[PDB]
Amino acid sequence: MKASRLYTLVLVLQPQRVLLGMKKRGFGAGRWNGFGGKVQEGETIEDGARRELQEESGLTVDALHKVGQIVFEFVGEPELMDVHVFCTDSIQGTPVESDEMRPCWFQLDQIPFKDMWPDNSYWFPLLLQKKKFHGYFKFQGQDTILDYTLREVDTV
Ligand SMILES: Nc1[nH]c(=O)nc2c1ncn2[C@H]1C[C@H](O)[C@@H](COP(=O)(O)OP(=O)(O)OP(=O)(O)O)O1
Ligand code: NA
Ligand code: NA
């Protein structure tokens, strides 16, 4: 197969709203996304998710809940992105804007799907229903899905 690199993604989901971060600079600026990044050597995936949430947004949490796993493949990139998806509802601190990311709350009837990664339209709804999932999405560039699979699972 291909090799994969481990990433995290954290959705701060409360009963009526979700916190997302807008990419401010670089390629892909303007898109809203959960918080996360590459897992580092030595840490568990969950601890890496907590670390990235704090580094990116300022927020801390005692614990996260794992809700999904999604593999992303990009045309022209040999390495797969293996993204472990977590959900907070409980959080310490206020979110902080950085030079790279602007955080913003959205009501759950105003989820900004058109300005999110296209895959989020498929798996976000499961997350809102408190379901767990496994997914795979192959992209041409940033906007076009060529193939995907999505399945609800009982155990992630
Ligand atoms: N199709 C997609 N759908 C989605 O919802 N999140 C995606 C995505 N593609 C990438 N991401 C998320 C996964 C992860 O949280 C982040 C990508 O990680 P980054 O490259 O930002 O990692 P790092 O911040 O560790 O990188 P460095 O700045 O080089 O350290 O974007
Ligand atoms: Na990141
Ligand atoms: Na990182």
C-alpha distances (whole Å) from 133 to each of 36, 56, 67, 126 are 18, 25, 7, 7
Q: State the structure-solving technique.
A: X-ray
Q: Whose CA is nearest to atom 6 of ligand 1?
A: 33
| Three-state secondary structure of the chain | CCCEEEEEEEEEECCCEEEEEEECCCCCCCCEECECCECCCCCCHHHHHHHHHHHHHCCECCCCEEEEEEEEEECCCCCEEEEEEEECCCCECCCCCCCCEEEEEEECCCCCHHHECCCHHHHHHHHHCCCEEEEEEEEECCCEEEEEEEEEECCC
Q: Is 119's C-beta closer than 6 angstroms to any atom of ligand 1?
A: yes
Domain that holds residue 15: 1-156
Resolution in A: 1.2
Q: Is 86's C-beta closer than 6 angstroms to any atom of ligand 1?
A: no
Q: Which amino acid is at 102?
A: R
Q: Is 5's C-beta closer than 6 angstroms to any atom of ligand 1?
A: no
Distance from C-alpha of 106 to C-alpha of 94, rounded to nearest angstrom: 15
Q: Which amino acid is at 20?
A: L
Residue 144, CA atoms < 13 Å, CB-side half-sphere: 4
Pairing mode of beta strands 132-140, 65-74: parallel
